[PDB]
Amino acid sequence: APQQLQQLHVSLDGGHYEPVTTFDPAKATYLQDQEALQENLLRLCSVNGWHKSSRAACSPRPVLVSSEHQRRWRELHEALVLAITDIVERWLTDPEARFPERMPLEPEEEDLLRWIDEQVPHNLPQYRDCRGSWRPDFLVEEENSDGSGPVENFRISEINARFSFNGFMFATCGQQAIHDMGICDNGNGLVGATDPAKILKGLLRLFQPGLPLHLLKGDEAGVDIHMLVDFLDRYLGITPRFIMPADLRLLHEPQAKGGYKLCCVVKNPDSCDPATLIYHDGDILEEIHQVGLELHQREIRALEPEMLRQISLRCFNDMRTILLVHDKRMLGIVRQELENLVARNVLTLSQAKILDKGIPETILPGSLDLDQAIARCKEMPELKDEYILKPIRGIVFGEDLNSEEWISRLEGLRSAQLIPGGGTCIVQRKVKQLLYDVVLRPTGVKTRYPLIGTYHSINGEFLGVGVWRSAISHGGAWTVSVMRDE
Numbered sequence: 036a037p038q039q040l041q042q043l044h045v046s047l048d049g050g051h052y053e054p055v056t057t058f059d060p061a062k063a064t065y066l067q068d069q070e071a072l073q074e075n076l077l078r079l080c081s082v083n084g085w086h087k088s089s090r091a092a093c094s095p096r097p098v099l100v101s102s103e104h105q106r107r108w109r110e111l112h113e114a115l116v117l118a119i120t121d122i123v124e125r126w127l128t129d130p131e132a133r134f135p136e137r138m139p140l141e142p143e144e145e146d147l148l149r150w151i152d153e154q155v156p157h158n159l160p161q162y163r164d165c166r167g168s169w170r171p172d173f174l175v176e177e178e179n180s181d182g183s184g185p186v187e188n189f190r191i192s193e194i195n196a197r198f199s200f201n202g203f204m205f206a207t208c209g210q211q212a213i214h215d216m217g218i219c220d221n222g223n224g225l226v227g228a229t230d231p232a233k234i235l236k237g238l239l240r241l242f243q244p245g246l247p248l249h250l251l252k253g254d255e256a257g258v259d260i261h262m263l264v265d266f267l268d269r270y271l272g273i274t275p276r277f278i279m280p281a282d283l284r285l286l287h288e289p290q291a292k293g294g295y296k297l298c299c300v301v302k303n304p305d306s307c308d309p310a311t312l313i314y315h316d317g318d319i320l321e322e323i324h325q326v327g328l329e330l331h332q333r334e335i336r337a338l339e340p341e342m343l344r345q346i347s348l349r350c351f352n353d354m355r356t357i358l359l360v361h362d363k364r365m366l367g368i369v370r371q372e373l374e375n376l377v378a379r380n381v382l383t384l385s386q387a388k389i390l391d392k393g394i395p396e397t398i399l400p401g402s403l404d405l406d407q408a409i410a411r412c413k414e415m416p417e418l419k420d421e422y423i424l425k426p427i428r429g430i431v432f433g434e435d436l437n438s439e440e441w442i443s444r445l446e447g448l449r450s451a452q453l454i455p456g457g458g459t460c461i462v463q464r465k466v467k468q469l470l471y472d473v474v475l476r477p478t479g480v481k482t483r484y485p486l487i488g489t490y491h492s493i494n495g496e497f498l499g500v501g502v503w504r505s506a507i508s509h510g511g512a513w514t515v516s517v518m519r520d521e
């Protein structure tokens with residue numbers, strides 16, 4: 036039988052580890068374990084950059100992952116990158132595929148994508164070269180393997196790709212802490228399942244640290260972004276400038292990228308090189324060479340169209356990542372494309388089967404799938420319990436609704452268009468998650484919860500499994516990963 040995911044207790048004075056299912060806690064020291072952990076989490080990120088909430092929700096009891104789990108995650112990722120990259124590069128250039136009619140975006144967004152296609156490859160790369168930061172989330176279900184036993188299966192529920200940093204600094208800080216504490220890598224039979232240097236170095240590849248960095252953020256409060264800015268300040272002497280949409284300016288310029296100078300207002304002008312400043316129309320400006328985006332889709336839509344094109348030439352993530360890869364419907368498009376992706380030699384046959392096992396069944400609005408769904412549920416009302424309704428741009432379970440209201444919702448999804456200024460739903464099969472023995476808080480309360488996983492990609496490269504959750508922002512306990520030393 037394959038080694039399962041499990042949470043370990045690890046003695047901080049000697050390193051002896053034991054599964055939580057089995058550990059007799061009669062003489063545990065959870066409170067002092069918690070304080071040691073929280074001190075250590077201040078190493079890469081000061082109290083300035085942390086939310087005290089999030090630093091306190093961390094658990095010194097890591098999740099044990101196996102080398103099979105790692106091979107599984109890396110393989111799913113390789114197939115995912117290949118499929119989604121091919122789809123994105125084909126979005127408007129393979130018209131017979133009808134992608135914008137199968138997954139409609141807002142019209143000013145589809146205008147933006149079409150402008151971007153006109154810039155490739157001389158002003159913007161082909162998409163394979165600028166995929167940026169993606170962070171998929173996965174759930175864990177059971178599957179009858181051949182192996183004649185139960186094996187853990189990972190289903191990607193969503194790809195987080197409009198922001199570039201969320202999750203990255205938590206994994207970096209947490210893996211570095213349990214290492215500094217000796218939980219792993221210190222001779223007790225455990226090693227860290229993710230290298231924090233690998234993760235952080237991926238982030239550093241999103242931008243050139245030689246040039247000044249701007250971070251454009253509006254209504255979003257931010258979490259990992261402030262931990263990165265803390266680490267850059269204290270360890271590298273890099274100080275990115277946060278700017279808001281209203282701070283942006285354009286100046287006419289022949290000899291410049293896209294015939295304009297993208298600028299922003301400067302709030303702290305005394306601390307700047309006076310030779311970097313422009314006094315224009317009552318504004319004190321500095322120029323923007325590279326900008327990281329932490330904006331909502333509506334905020335992006337609210338930019339003046341020329342302002343929006345000038346951001347696209349200078350921004351990470353690329354607008355194709357933010358608008359296409361982040362959208363939950365793209366998981367539906369990948370499933371539609373599997374047979375076509377093997378016909379084009381984009382996926383091997385087994386890679387298509389890996390993807391089909393790694394993405395839950397997803398029905399898109401305006402699809403024939405959604406039509407046969409409505410028919411199948413009219414002939415089998417018990418079916419609605421097996422599915423859910425996730426929003427794109429608040430999940431809704433079919434077992435929590437009457438059959439009359441369920442066919443109603445589905446009947447309203449027969450067009451693929453988006454509600455003006457809003458979105459739509461996808462219909463996804465409910466994943467039956469495994470339950471795990473866990474001790475998440477220093478209270479010592481053993482419970483039996485599911486595990487929510489995530490992993491980190493930069494420019495298509497798998498960087499490591501991310502933190503385990505059982506959202507950290509809404510209070511959730513979290514931890515990181517170890518492997519047997521064998």
Ligand SMILES: Nc1ncnc2c1ncn2[C@@H]1O[C@H](CO)[C@@H](O)[C@H]1O
Pocket residue numbers: 172174192193395423425430463464465466467487
């Ligand atoms: N396909 C799915 N089946 C069941 N729950 C889901 C699914 N997609 C998202 N979720 C919910 O969203 C959370 C993670 O986004 C899960 O823990 C679960 O509550």
